[PDB]
């Protein structure tokens, strides 16, 4: 359990994937040339998880970059740290998917998918002990969502014993005007319920709300949003990247957080919330971080945690602080707020501390929750889906590429089924 193979697909996928690689590179003392320039062996101890060791004492991200649109690859290579990526792990195609799930999943995406599988075979056979895969993508578009879930199931077919983990960005009409995003999202959700082990739910609605309400950015850009995504991705992979008292891996997380195979969609949370490139004039206290972590404003999914109950919680604190004080306040929040933890999963809140802070913050905390309150996100998608599908709105965009009304009907009841079992366990009695 060491090496992870990373895949980023489509515009959203490649842009949040890029920012992930910049961020953990700075944390790990790697410059865009690929050279280590840091001051701690701790930055290098577990570096094999994401980076291949290279000639010249270089380091190259174990990363595969994918898009049907040729433009995003040039934008990544132009981007800071664009040169760090293996040039042969760039797989690109001729035309976009036109925000069409069926184009990415069934037609054009299927032409490119074999080529992607070749790059994946190489990076994974060069691995001593392959944990599995992490995928960044959107669900509203056509490539990251439609070819993204195609790729997932094809990787499943070859590597059925490795963990399949995704960072999946959820659409919001606040951030994109493209009307068929509820369809693309409900199609993708179907495939994810069936074929991934862990999915962090990164909600564009929540990201826009944070930027508008807490960051007073009147007109937030994808860069304003992706700062929040990049902070979370750093936070939830800290315990893979850095040595700790538990040797976290993707499978130990899946085993301790997912009590039922379908309920594997996590609600991530971060504190403190900041704007990109903004000096922090004073950090926060540990009890502050603890409280603000179970605060609806600090969630990357647009759900109020006090509207459901947590099945499992994992909490990562970063910075120099007393683990005594941390476990203290953490237990306090559990006792004062006992009605929001399921009774029939004992000791279901695990917390870790890592002395190494993220760039620009003296102290941070990061929250990975499996809350039934996540049904709100899916209900919102289902409502938008039904609004359009009652009218059979835009359905010929998909039947033209070969699909059938039944596949739609199916993915809706499956999401609705998902909603109802999140409810089953929310109302479940220990007695």
């Amino acid at each position: 359990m060491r090496e992870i193979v990373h895949i980023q697909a489509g515009q959203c996928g490649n842009q949040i994937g890029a920012k992930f690689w910049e961020v953990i590179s700075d944390e790990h003392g790697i410059d865009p040339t690929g050279s280590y320039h840091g001051d701690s062996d701790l930055q290098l101890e577990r570096i094999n998880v994401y980076y291949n060791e290279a000639t010249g004492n270089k380091y190259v991200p174990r990363a595969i970059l994918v898009d049907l649109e040729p433009g995003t690859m040039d934008s990544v290579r132009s981007g800071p740290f664009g040169q760090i990526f293996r040039p042969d792990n760039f797989v690109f195609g001729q035309s976009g998917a036109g925000n069409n799930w069926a184009k990415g999943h069934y037609t054009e995406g299927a032409e490119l998918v074999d080529s992607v599988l070749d790059v994946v075979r190489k990076e994974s056979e060069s691995c001593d002990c392959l944990q599995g895969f992490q995928l960044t993508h959107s669900l509203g578009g056509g490539t990251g969502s439609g070819m993204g879930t195609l790729l997932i199931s094809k990787i499943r077919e070859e590597y059925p014993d490795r963990i399949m983990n995704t960072f999946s960005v959820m659409p919001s009409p606040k951030v994109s005007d493209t009307v068929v995003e509820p369809y693309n999202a409900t199609l993708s959700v179907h495939q994810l319920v069936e074929n991934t082990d862990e999915t962090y739910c990164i909600d564009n609605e929540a990201l826009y709300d944070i930027c508008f309400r807490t960051l007073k950015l009147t007109t937030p850009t994808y860069g304003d949003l992706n700062h929040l995504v990049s902070a979370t991705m750093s936070g939830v992979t800290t315990c893979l990247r850095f040595p700790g008292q538990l040797n976290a891996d993707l499978r130990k997380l899946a085993v301790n957080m997912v009590p039922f195979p379908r309920l594997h969609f996590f609600m991530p949370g971060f504190a403190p919330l900041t704007s990109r490139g903004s000096q922090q004039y004073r950090a926060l206290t540990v009890p502050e971080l603890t409280q603000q972590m179970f605060d609806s404003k600090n969630m990357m999914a647009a759900c109020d945690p006090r509207h459901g109950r947590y099945l499992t919680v994992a909490a990562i604190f970063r910075g120099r602080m007393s683990m005594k004080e941390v476990d203290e306040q953490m237990l306090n929040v559990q006792n004062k707020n006992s009605s929001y933890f399921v009774e029939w999963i004992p000791n279901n809140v695990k917390t870790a501390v890592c002395d190494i802070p993220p760039r620009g913050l003296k102290m941070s905390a990061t929250f990975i929750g499996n809350s039934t309150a996540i049904q709100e996100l899916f209900k919102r998608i289902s409502e938008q889906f039904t609004a359009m599908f009652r009218r059979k709105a835009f359905l010929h965009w998909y039947t033209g590429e070969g699909m059938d009304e039944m596949e739609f009907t199916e993915a809706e009841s499956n999401m609705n089924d998902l909603v109802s079992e999140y409810q089953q366990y929310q109302d479940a009695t220990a007695d």
Binding site: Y106, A110, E157, N195, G400
Partner: protein, 123 residues
């Protein structure tokens, strides 16, 4: 009445009668011994033969005990051996069947993709 009896170098004897009697007048082979002695020996040897016989019965019980415990160990080993091989084979078969089911559903899905691509060509 004294009646002289005898006299000699170192002795003299006689008899004194005070009153005469009221009334006048007066009112195993070597084989049998050897047989009785040999008989006592025979039953002596028989009881000693009974004592050693009941002592020899005790030795056989002691071997039966050591034997039983050896049989118990061996039967414990054999039961554990069959338990483990049954469990490990059932677990392998179960695991292999779950993995077979996981790959069959995915394969039904990639059959559907070929069917979806067919309808597009049709129209």
């Amino acid at each position: 009445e004294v009646i002289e009896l005898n006299k000699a170098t170192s002795g003299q004897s006689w008899e004194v009668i005070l009153k005469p009697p009221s009334f006048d007048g007066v009112p195993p082979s070597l084989e049998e011994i050897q047989k009785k002695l040999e008989a006592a020996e025979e039953r002596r040897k028989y009881q000693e033969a009974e004592l050693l016989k009941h002592l020899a019965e005790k030795r056989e019980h002691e071997r039966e005990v050591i034997q039983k415990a050896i049989e118990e160990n061996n039967n414990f080993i054999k039961m554990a051996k069959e338990k483990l091989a049954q469990k490990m084979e059932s677990n392998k078969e179960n695991r292999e069947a779950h993995l077979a089911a996981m790959l069959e559903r995915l394969q039904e899905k990639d059959k559907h993709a070929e069917e979806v691509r067919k309808n597009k060509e049709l129209k």
